[PDB]
Symmetry: C3
Subunit: 222 residues, 3 copies
């Protein structure tokens, strides 16, 4: 298409699509209730991402926001993706270690604030206030990362959790950086590079993460 980031949106679409199909196939014939939870969560995540990547590719998930005296292209569909996929990823982690309901609520609530404030930040027309929202969102992320380390271990699941939590902490922490330097923030990195960066992170955090989880038998019970 006419926007140079189209190739990364097309690639993200294809990779989320393939990942979804792969997880769909791998989860066929799974009878264990706990495994069924993990396959459902883990397959949904790339399915959702697939749809939102497609919406970006086709132009539906893009809006123009005026700030700094110009029209800035903002892919709002990312936030629609993240709104559902990030709590689902936390839920995968949380179920893995049999987190109590209270901790799950805290995680999901904090995550909604993170994404919600991120979206407000992304759509805010007063440039300086965009970063206020960024800071609030980042505080919520830090709370999530804090809980992931200090807020939950059954030896069925201990080592897989530890790996998935580390992947999670590393990949998630990059998102606020990318937003801060990209088109939503300071605008030091052009939109095509920012889209490439989010695409690598997204596929890694969704399909990558899923592969690690759905390859470990921490999800199965004999």
């Amino acid at each position: 298409t006419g926007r140079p980031e189209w190739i990364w949106l097309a690639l993200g679409t294809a990779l989320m699509g393939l990942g979804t199909l792969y997880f769909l196939v791998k989860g066929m014939g799974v009878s264990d209730p706990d495994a069924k939870k993990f396959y459902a969560i883990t397959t949904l995540v790339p399915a959702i991402a697939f749809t939102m990547y497609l919406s970006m590719l086709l132009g539906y998930g893009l809006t123009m926001v005026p700030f700094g005296g110009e029209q800035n292209p903002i892919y709002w569909a990312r936030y629609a993706d993240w709104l559902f996929t990030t709590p689902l990823l936390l839920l995968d982690l949380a179920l893995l270690v049999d987190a109590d309901q209270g901790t799950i609520l805290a995680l999901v609530g904090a995550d909604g604030i993170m994404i919600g404030t991120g979206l407000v930040g992304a759509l805010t027309k007063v440039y300086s206030y965009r970063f206020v929202w960024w800071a609030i969102s980042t505080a919520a992320m830090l709370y999530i990362l804090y809980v992931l380390f200090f807020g939950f271990m059954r030896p069925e699941v201990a080592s897989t959790f530890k790996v998935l939590r580390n992947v999670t902490v590393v990949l998630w922490s990059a998102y606020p950086v990318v937003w801060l330097i990209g088109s939503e923030g300071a605008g030091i990195v052009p939109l095509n590079i920012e889209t490439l960066l989010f695409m690598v992170l997204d596929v890694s955090a969704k399909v990558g993460f899923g592969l690690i989880l759905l390859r470990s038998r921490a999800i199965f019970g004999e």
Copy 2:
């Protein structure tokens, strides 16, 4: 009002309203926890539909979307209705057969994708892409219908489930057809007829379904 479909919106409003009141009355004095689940779900469904039918009647739930070089009237409030009511109907089915959490998640997740992509399709300005979204939404529906047959039987509930699943499969499958031929899609059937069609389906799938469920003592325990 000035739009010929108003009569079907008025009738849908009245029928959802009456259905809600009826279920509200029938659920008074119900003490059994499991029955309370089914009455709550089943009463909420038409209550929600009532509100969205009203919004359509009054014009709030209607927007104009440009595609094919014209302004097309699109009732977006349908998707707001379906977003909550369709997962609730799946939940009624799922609770009936004591589905595990993983299957519930899969159903609700697939359903959100179905409705979500349907809405994107309904609001997409590039005509040809409207049908891409339709296809994705239909794939999600097919997955739901697949799970309803192959993805879950306690003899308390077996025969009522089978009836409700068949009603569900027949009525739900018509929605993508109606959308495809109506004002959101190919535009072969005028909006008034499409509204009539959705109204018959909606009342059948919500009030009709509810009557069957809430008349069978598959929901009660002595």
Copy 3:
């Protein structure tokens, strides 16, 4: 700022922010699963309110709606706040008395209708219909208040529930009054006074409520 209600938005922001921090601090070192539920719910409520108060302060959460032949300032962010915070407050009450799932569903569903129809009412351009939505929303509120009295007692929790339910019934019942007389409704009270009123109610219903709950050991188990 240029809008006279800014002081009440600034004060609400500060008070929700401080309340969140206070509950965050009080919940540190809490190990009991049930207490963890109540701290998570109760801390999230003001955190969410904080974000939406901020959005109003900064102007993001304000839109202009034409009705009565003029442009009316409508703070839509209130509904975004209430959408999440009101069900969470009901959930606190419901968990306290070990409500069954069916009653929880009914409460949360009714609450969504209340807020949803409130928002439709707030954004409706035909003046007279604004009050139709108000009435539907108020009916949903009345149903909630009905369930809070007749729809659920374990002596661990009985007396704290009774206090929190009374605070809830008194404060919540004022919201429809304020909306009816304020800028969203009949317009007899200017927006600055209405904002002041909602701010007093909000802080009382969120931070006030939370203090009562999180000070009673009805949430702890030895």
